[PDB]
Amino acid sequence: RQVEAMLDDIRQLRKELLLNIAIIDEYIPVEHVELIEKYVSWSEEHGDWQLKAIAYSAPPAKKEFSNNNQTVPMYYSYRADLGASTA
């Protein structure tokens, strides 16, 4: 109980940091990380960094193919073929 939490915090934080560093090395390249490095500002009173963030629309729909070859009109109508309402 001498120094256990003080190194356990370092172990957990270094584990999370290695995970984040591994995923960012997996995704973003080596030049873009250097570009991001010079466009961020640390805050001592806020406790976080700051950058110019925004978003980070959508297609409506796609006319998918159909297999209903039965397109011949078939049903009739009293109100269209005979010109009279059914009420």
């Binding site: 995704y27 973003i28 390249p29 080596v30 030049e31 873009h32 466009y39 110019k52 925004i54 978003a55 980070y56 297609p59 209903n68 039965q70 078939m74 049903y75 009739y76 109508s77 009293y78 109100r79 005979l82 009279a84 059914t86 009420a87």
Partner: protein, 552 residues
């Protein structure tokens, strides 16, 4: 004709039998058409007939059926319909059905709280009412030959009355069922009648009739369901309703049963249900015996899209399709080669059945509008297989020169004029066969001298996403082989630049296969992984890059 006034005076007698004796005599007189004009032109007769149908009918089903069948015999000829409509005869049947529906409901609610003798009395009354309503609806059906009077009757609540009459006789089928179903069949031609029909739940009431032994009711029900099944919604209602199993047995009996079974088999669940029916052997009976039909081969093509159906058609060892392919090749039947291609589309041990027909189908596909269609079907049958040796066939059949000749025909034309060519589908089948073939290393080394042709074709044909997808699938099958992997992964590869451009395409499948190749190209080359990651990051934070360039 010698005692017509005697029958009229019997109608004037206030006795139950004195009326019905003259009524049945008048009905047997109307049974012949010679004096039918003489009696329909008798004014005092039909007026008294309609009046006695109005008065003595509630308590007397013995006379209201005779005096209605007489009207049916009069309505058997259309030149007398004007003399019938000059009287209020048509309204009589509508009022009779409207009253007897509620009376049958009251009787069915009375049966649950009554003794035994009154129960038999109510049963006999329901039977006599069914005969009377059958005669009335048959008279209305014969009157409805004029669409004008049919619309005039539909103006009054009619389709609801017919659905009620169908629900009445839905249990104990009688002439009322056949007559009301024929009338609903005639009314289903129009849209408003179909809407009022299916709004009252007619499809389920029809599905709850099977099995039915009467051939006339069977044909009428299947034809009415045939009129119903041309809506997008009524087909699932019948498939989930169990219409398929008891209809599959009717394929050998009725004629409209096949017509309905095709429309059912257009749905996938109907194919899955027919997978466990005897009809799969019935179609193979009619196709192989030579007394086939276009609807039979069409439903057989729709059926073989299920794996169980293809396994059933294939037999146990190959003898099932060895006859079908022989009849397809010798008689040049395009429908049978379509069925064979649908059978070959399935993956599994069934493709070994096709191992004996590889060279023959390739030879048919090389030198063969119907001829080109048969060659396309054979090429698609050969392309679906992946268990074939391929390494042997690709050289024993000289596939490489022929594929290079076909793929190069139509090159350098701009897709605008040449993407609608007749040769285009065959090129797609050739690309699909090259992709299914290049997964083996020997076939890939044999197809190697075609990579430049694939690259030219990829830079050319771009308007259709599917051709690009199959070409990239062929390239992905090539990249996985270590012997030819580095051959395509040069630092300035045209395939790599094209995939980098296609990484941001509208189609999802094309970018899926594109990523499936890009993560292989970057696995064996660290620099390619850096270029791919740089392309991926410039398409998601490009707004930040633009805003920081505007800030500078």
């Amino acid at each position: 004709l010698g005692k017509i006034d005697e029958y009229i005076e019997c109608f004037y007698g206030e006795t139950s039998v004195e009326k019905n004796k003259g009524a049945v005599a008048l009905y047997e007189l109307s049974k012949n058409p010679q004096n039918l004009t003489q009696l329909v032109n008798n004014e005092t007769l039909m007026m008294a007939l309609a009046r006695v149908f109005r008065e003595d009918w509630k308590k007397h089903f013995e006379v209201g059926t005779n005096i209605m069948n007489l009207f049916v015999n009069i309505s058997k000829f259309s030149c007398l319909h004007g003399i019938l409509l000059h009287h209020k005869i048509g309204t009589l049947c509508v009022n009779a059905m409207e009253h007897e529906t509620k009376r049958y409901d009251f009787w069915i609610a009375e049966m649950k709280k009554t003794d035994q003798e009154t129960l038999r009395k109510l049963k006999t009354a329901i039977r006599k009412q069914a005969m009377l309503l059958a005669a009335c609806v048959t008279f209305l059906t014969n009157l409805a030959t004029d669409i004008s009077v049919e619309l005039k009757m539909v103006r009054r609540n009619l389709v609801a009355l017919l659905v009620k009459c169908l629900q009445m006789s839905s249990e104990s089928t009688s002439s009322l069922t056949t007559a009301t179903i024929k009338f609903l069949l005639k009314l289903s031609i129009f849209d408003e009648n179909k809407i009022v029909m299916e709004q009252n739940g007619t499809i389920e009431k029809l599905l709850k009739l099977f099995p039915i032994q009467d051939p006339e009711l069977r044909k009428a029900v299947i034809m009415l369901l045939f009129n119903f099944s041309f809506d997008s919604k009524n087909l699932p209602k019948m498939v989930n309703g169990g219409l398929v199993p008891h209809m599959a047995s009717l394929l050998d009996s009725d004629t409209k049963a096949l017509n309905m079974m095709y429309l059912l088999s257009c749905n996938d669940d109907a194919k899955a249900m027919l997978a466990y029916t005897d009809a799969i052997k019935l179609l193979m009976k009619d196709v192989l015996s030579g007394t086939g039909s276009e609807v039979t081969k069409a439903v057989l093509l729709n059926i073989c899209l299920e794996k169980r159906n293809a396994q059933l058609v294939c037999g146990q060892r190959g003898q099932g399709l060895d006859l079908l392919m022989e009849m397809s090749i010798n008689s040049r039947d395009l429908m049978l080669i379509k069925v064979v291609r649908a059978i070959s589309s399935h993956e599994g041990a069934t493709q070994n059945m096709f191992l004996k027909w590889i060279e023959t189908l390739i030879g048919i596909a090389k030198n063969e509008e119907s001829k080109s269609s048969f060659g396309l079907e054979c090429m698609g049958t050969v392309a679906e297989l992946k268990v074939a040796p391929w390494a042997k066939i690709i050289q024993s059949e000289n596939l490489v020169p022929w594929m290079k000749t076909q793929l190069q025909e139509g090159i350098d034309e701009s897709e605008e004029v040449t993407v609608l060519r007749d040769i285009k589908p065959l090129q797609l089948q050739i690309v699909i066969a090259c992709g299914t073939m290049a997964r083996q290393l020997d076939a890939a080394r044999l197809l190697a001298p075609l990579i430049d042709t694939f690259v030219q074709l990829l830079q050319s044909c771009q308007i259709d996403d599917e051709f690009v997808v199959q070409l990239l699938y062929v390239f992905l099958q090539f990249l996985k082989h270590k012997e030819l992997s580095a051959r395509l992964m040069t630092q300035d590869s045209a395939l790599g630049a094209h995939m980098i451009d296609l990484m941001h395409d509208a189609n999802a499948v094309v970018r899926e296969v594109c990523d499936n190749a890009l993560l292989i190209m970057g696995e064996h080359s660290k620099e390619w992984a850096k270029r791919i990651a740089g392309e991926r990051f410039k398409w998601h934070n490009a707004q930040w890059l633009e805003m920081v360039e505007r800030d500078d």
